[PDB]
Every structure is written in structure tokens, then in C-alpha cells.
Amino acid sequence: MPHAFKPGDLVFAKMKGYPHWPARIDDIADGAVKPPPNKYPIFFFGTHETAFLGPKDLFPYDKSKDKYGKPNKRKGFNEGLWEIQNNPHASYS
């Protein structure tokens, strides 16, 4: 049975105007800016951008990869697919 999301969980994350995107729940570094209440720091693979999202926009990777894990024209997407499959917990600083 599912738990709450935690740092390190891999997802596809949905933002307005973008396809479901390979992403992870990030940690918040000591001294770093915290998310709003009820939001998680999402790190988008490929673009290496961060946004704050709630669970309604977070689709667990293993369940969703057959649907959303396909090449896309969008900038950064296909690099993102390599990252999530090959080294999803690396530092992409």
C-alpha cells in the first residue's frame, strides 16, 4: 500500500502546458528555501528546473512509465528520460 511521497521518489510531474515530465521529489538542503505548505520540491530531469507541486500533479514513475515515458520534441525531455532511467539519484547541480 502507498505511502506519502518522500525525497528520492521518482515520478512524472504534470505542469500546465507541458507533457507529463520525468522528475523526482527533491530534498531541501540545509539553509535552502522551503516549499509552500502541502507542496513538494520537484526536480525535473533534463531541464534540471525545480517547481513546487502537490500530489495531484505527481504520478509514480513505475506505474506511469508505459504511458508517459516516450520521446517528446520538447527541450530537455529526452535527456530527462535518460536521467530518470539511468541515474535518477545523481547530483545534477
From Swiss-Prot:
It is found in: Nucleus; Cytoplasm. Widely expressed. High expression is found in heart, skeletal muscle, ovary and testis. Overexpression is frequently observed in hepatocellular carcinoma samples. Residues 7-64 form the PWWP domain. Interacts with HDGF. Interacts with trimethylated 'Lys-36' of histone H3 (H3K36me3). Interacts with trimethylated 'Lys-79' of histone H3 (H3K79me3), but has higher affinity for H3K36me3. Interacts with IWS1. Interacts with H2AX, POGZ, RBBP8 and CBX1. Interacts with histones H3K9me3, H3K27me3 and H3K36me2. Interacts with DPF3a (isoform 2 of DPF3/BAF45C). Interacts with SMARCA4/BRG1/BAF190A, SMARCC1/BAF155 and SMARCD1/BAF60A in a DPF3a-dependent manner. Acts as an epigenetic regulator of myogenesis in cooperation with DPF3a (isoform 2 of DPF3/BAF45C). Associates with the BAF complex via its interaction with DPF3a and HDGFL2-DPF3a activate myogenic genes by increasing chromatin accessibility through recruitment of SMARCA4/BRG1/BAF190A (ATPase subunit of the BAF complex) to myogenic gene promoters. Promotes the repair of DNA double-strand breaks (DSBs) through the homologous recombination pathway by facilitating the recruitment of the DNA endonuclease RBBP8 to the DSBs. Belongs to the HDGF family. This is Hepatoma-derived growth factor-related protein 2. It comes from Homo sapiens (Human). The lineage of its organism: Eukaryota, Metazoa, Chordata, Craniata, Vertebrata. The gene is HDGFL2. The chain holds residues 1 to 93 of 671 of the full protein.
